[PDB]
């Protein structure tokens, strides 16, 4: 029932479309920067030179504790990329554990489609493993340094909180967007039980999906297709991204379930918004979506179920009218499944690195209505789940 990490509760701001960020300080004296929380990468980097979208940036010449690694680094993401210079410096998380650590920092000097206008963040915190760090795995990720240099338990958990309606930059600034609990699990952030799935391999936070349902109906594909090439949990990706074949089958089924209303192809491709008169969004015509994940017990699985309140992303109207509008936050992928922010907004997610597993529980801040709620349920007797993993 009780929440025991109050200092870190509500330490995030942001929204699915622009990322969730936590305040951090780098250097001596401390330079404050807003840093996006990215479980899909492993490099800690911060803008280190002016940019149209940055209000502030890291000034190495003003930090007495700055150490130059004299080495360049380049990091490309599914969308966006940056070029930077490596070094180390002291880092702290004001609303985080009360420790300061020396960590690797890539000072971003050039970038393309990386920073977002009005996002309010100026850096990125890649929380995944060394295996995918650039230039290579010799560059210790921030979380690893943190755990090696302190007594912080080797675990962190994320409660990303979507508002369910749009927020402009000033509202994002003044609102709580969630929590990143470093070193533990805060029980006030979820309801029900935590169910855990194994981390298949420590590079991205990779998991195995063994079954997919749309309003209880089995998509009925070879489960290998669901993880075709990999399935990862990524706080830095807006959408639920699915391998091309799974995306097409899912969209067909979601269109069939919501067919009482018809939407332009642009809507299903994630490109155009759809609007309804204030308060009339027809939540009940859209289906719930269930992802079944391999359990920790042999032949056991559990499922996490989200609502259209999670996969329909609120966006501001073209004329900022009083209509309630959204974009379809499910899109195709050529690099496997990505359980992005719209999935994470339904749940409290525990990245239990020490025990190589990821925990899911219904979030205390997930958006829902009076008829349905997100769910995490189990167990289900499931067979040959490792066959679902792609090699």
């Amino acid at each position: 029932r009780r929440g025991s990490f109050v200092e870190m509760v509500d330490n995030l701001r942001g929204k699915s479309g622009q990322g969730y960020y936590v305040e951090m300080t780098v250097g001596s004296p401390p330079q404050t920067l807003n840093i996006l929380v990215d479980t899909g990468s492993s490099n800690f980097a911060v803008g280190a030179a002016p940019h149209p979208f940055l209000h502030r940036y890291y000034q190495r010449q003003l930090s007495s504790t700055y150490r130059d690694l004299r080495k360049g680094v380049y990091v490309p993401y599914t969308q966006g990329k940056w070029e930077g210079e490596l070094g180390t410096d002291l880092v702290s998380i004001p609303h985080g554990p009360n420790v300061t650590v020396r960590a690797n920092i890539a000072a971003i000097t050039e970038s393309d489609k990386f920073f977002i206008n009005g996002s309010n963040w100026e850096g990125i915190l890649g929380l995944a493993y060394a295996e995918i760090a650039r230039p290579d795995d010799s560059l210790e990720p921030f979380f690893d340094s943190l755990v090696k240099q302190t007594h912080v338990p080797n675990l962190f958990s994320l409660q990303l909180c979507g508002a369910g309606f749009p927020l402009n930059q000033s509202e994002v600034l003044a609102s709580v967007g969630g929590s990143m609990i470093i070193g533990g699990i805060d029980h006030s952030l979820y309801t029900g039980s935590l169910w855990y799935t194994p981390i298949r391999r420590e590079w991205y936070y990779e998991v195995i999906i063994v079954r997919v349902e749309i309003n209880g109906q089995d998509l009925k594909m070879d489960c290998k297709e669901y993880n075709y090439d990999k399935s990862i949990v990524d706080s830095g990706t807006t959408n639920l991204r699915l391998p091309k074949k799974v995306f097409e089958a899912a969209v067909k089924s979601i269109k069939a379930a919501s067919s009482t209303e018809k939407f332009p192809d642009g809507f299903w491709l994630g490109e155009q918004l759809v609007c309804w008169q204030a308060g009339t969004t027809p939540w009940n015509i859209f289906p719930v979506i269930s992802l079944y994940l391999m359990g920790e017990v042999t032949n056991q699985s559990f499922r996490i179920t989200i609502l259209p309140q999670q996969y329909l992303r609120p966006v501001e109207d073209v004329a900022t009218s009083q209509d309630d509008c959204y974009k379809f936050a499910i899109s195709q992928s050529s690099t496997g499944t990505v359980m992005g922010a719209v999935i994470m907004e339904g749940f409290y997610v525990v990245f239990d690195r020490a025990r190589k597993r990821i925990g899911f529980a219904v979030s205390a801040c997930h958006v829902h209505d009076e008829f349905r709620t997100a769910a995490v349920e189990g167990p289900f007797v499931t067979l040959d789940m490792e066959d679902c993993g792609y090699n």
Partner: peptide
Amino acid sequence: EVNXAEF
């Protein structure tokens, strides 16, 4: 939209 390390 954000789509954060390559592929």
